[PDB]
């Protein structure tokens, strides 16, 4: 198994598309190098270390698809999935930069070096999602605000921007209540619900 061949397979997996000598194992929900990809055990270990981005990204793709698959998510869940989409655009841009230097090169060392930050960012986003799964309206806002207390200023600032954006729907509803006293809640989203 050529190292560059595995590199191409991983370049696909980083986009969530399992590679040619690695298969995304349902037993692991992540890329598992096909044992037929006989290489250095160090090589397979490096592939496994890189595949965490693939596992997390696959989980994220599934989750953001599940959140956009239901219109009951509301504008808030839609904003969550859309922020996920913007972050996915950023991650895809990172993968595109990766294909950029994939031309002409680098090595698995540089790949994992530039993916260490991607791995951390993916972990932060995944922690936010896993700590906000199954929350709705105020329960979703509180799920975000609960993760809005941790350290790690990079992930914290990403979450802060996300929360400032997410308050935009909530803020708009509150401003409607303040100025118009307007609650157009399809599913009684507003804290000041109404009794029809």
């Amino acid at each position: 198994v050529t190292e560059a061949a595995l590199v191409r397979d991983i370049l696909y997996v980083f986009q969530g598309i399992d590679g040619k000598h690695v298969k995304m194992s349902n037993a692991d929900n992540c890329y598992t190098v096909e044992g037929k990809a006989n290489l250095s055990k160090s090589l397979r270990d490096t592939a496994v270390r890189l595949a965490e981005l693939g596992w997390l990204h696959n989980k994220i793709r599934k989750y953001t698809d599940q959140r956009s698959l239901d219109r009951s998510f509301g504008l808030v869940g839609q904003s969550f999935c859309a922020a996920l989409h913007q972050e996915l655009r950023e991650y895809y841009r990172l993968l595109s930069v990766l294909h950029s230097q994939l031309q002409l090169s680098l090595t698995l060392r540089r790949l994992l070096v530039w993916t260490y930050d991607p791995k951390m960012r993916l972990k932060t986003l995944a922690a936010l999602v896993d700590h906000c799964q199954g929350r709705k309206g105020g329960e979703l806002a509180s799920a975000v605000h609960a993760y809005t207390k941790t350290g790690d200023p990079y992930a914290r600032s990403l979450v802060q921007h996300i929360l400032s954006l997410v308050s935009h729907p909530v803020l708009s509803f509150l401003y409607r209540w303040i100025y118009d006293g307007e609650l157009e809640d399809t599913y009684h989203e507003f804290f000041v619900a109404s009794d029809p």
Partner: protein
């Protein structure tokens, strides 16, 4: 190799330390503390990557490795010991800051560690201050 291995455990444990203390039950400030260590462990990785450049040039000599591993094993070791103590004492709150200031005065004498801990304490103060 055994002489150069010493940073091996310093990185295995350093990765464990950057993982374990990230928990919010390990503190959000101690999560920042692990993130701060992430910056340097990333530099240690980057230096291992640039070492890959010299290996990809087919121009690696064991002396040049040790000649370079010597400068960085100390940089790994100082933070490895400070993190080992930071979890061996389970330090948290202002007691952890006390331990940090102590280890700062204890790493006084090695500016290769004193200035690094000067930045470490500077970063840690943010949540504390």
């Amino acid at each position: 190799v055994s002489r150069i291995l010493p940073v091996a455990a310093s990185y295995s444990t350093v990765t464990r330390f950057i993982e374990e203390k990230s928990s919010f039950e390990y503190g959000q400030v101690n999560h920042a503390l692990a993130a701060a260590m992430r910056t340097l462990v990333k530099e240690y990785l980057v230096l291992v990557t640039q070492l890959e450049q010299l290996q990809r040039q087919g121009l690696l000599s064991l002396q040049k490795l040790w000649f370079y591993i010597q400068p960085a094993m100390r940089s790994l070791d100082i933070l490895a010991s400070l993190a080992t103590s930071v979890d061996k004492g389970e330090c948290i709150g202002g007691a952890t800051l006390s331990l940090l200031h102590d280890r700062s005065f204890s790493y006084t004498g090695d500016s290769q560690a004193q200035e690094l801990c000067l930045h470490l304490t500077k970063a840690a103060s943010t949540p504390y201050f």
